[PDB]
């Protein structure tokens, strides 16, 4: 006795009709959902299915360094370049690929901030089975951030706007920095 409604993407040949109580649940995993290009910067305009996302990255974007590991160091090199900057690299593990982004942003004149965050090439259900931990180290001080990996769909400009990430001013950076390099520890774990 319910009313059911076509999946959003059906205009991309999805043939599913579901009560509204349930249309999200599937609309998320609906394999017809098309993704933008995860790579920070409006440079690329590719679009394809989740599954086409990881090949796309390892095809048109080979600047992106990769690593197998559950714990690494993401070493953001030459931290003091003046203006906006972006480090990006990738971390494979648990049969998934996560994408780490350090990002400097001068969005309020004179107050330049770093904003670091992680995101899973996967869905939001998928992200939830995981936690990341970025951590900075300096002389007798440490600053650690935990969260669950953002999702390539959701993206990260809002995360970044809300400051739902790790974030630290340059003065801070300096105390954690190494010959102009900022070493970020990163561990991804399961749950």
């Amino acid at each position: 006795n319910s009313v059911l409604f076509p999946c959003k993407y059906a205009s991309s040949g999805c043939e599913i009709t579901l009560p509204h109580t349930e249309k999200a649940e599937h609309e998320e995993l609906c394999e017809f959902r098309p993704y933008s290009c995860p790579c920070p910067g409006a440079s690329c305009k590719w679009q394809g299915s989740l599954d086409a996302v990881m090949p796309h990255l390892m095809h048109q974007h080979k600047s992106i360094t990769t690593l197998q590991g559950e714990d690494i160091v993401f070493l953001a090199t030459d931290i003091n370049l003046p203006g906006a900057v972006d480090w990006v690299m990738m971390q494979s593990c648990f049969g998934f690929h996560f994408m780490l982004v350090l990002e400097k942003q001068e969005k309020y004149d004179g107050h330049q901030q770093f904003f670091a965050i992680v995101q899973l090439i996967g869905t939001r259900k998928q992200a939830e089975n995981f936690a990341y931990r970025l951590e900075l180290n300096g002389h007798r001080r440490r600053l650690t951030w935990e969260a669950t990996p953002r999702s390539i769909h959701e993206g990260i400009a809002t995360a970044i706007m809300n400051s739902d990430c790790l974030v630290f001013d340059t003065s801070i950076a300096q105390l954690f920095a190494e010959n102009g390099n900022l070493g970020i520890n990163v561990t991804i774990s399961m749950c």
């Binding site: 590991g69 993401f74 203006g83 972006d86």
Partner: peptide
């Protein structure tokens, strides 16, 4: 001790 990825800035 972990692997290190020496990453470069872009714009």
């Amino acid at each position: 001790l972990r692997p290190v990825a020496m990453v470069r800035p872009t714009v």
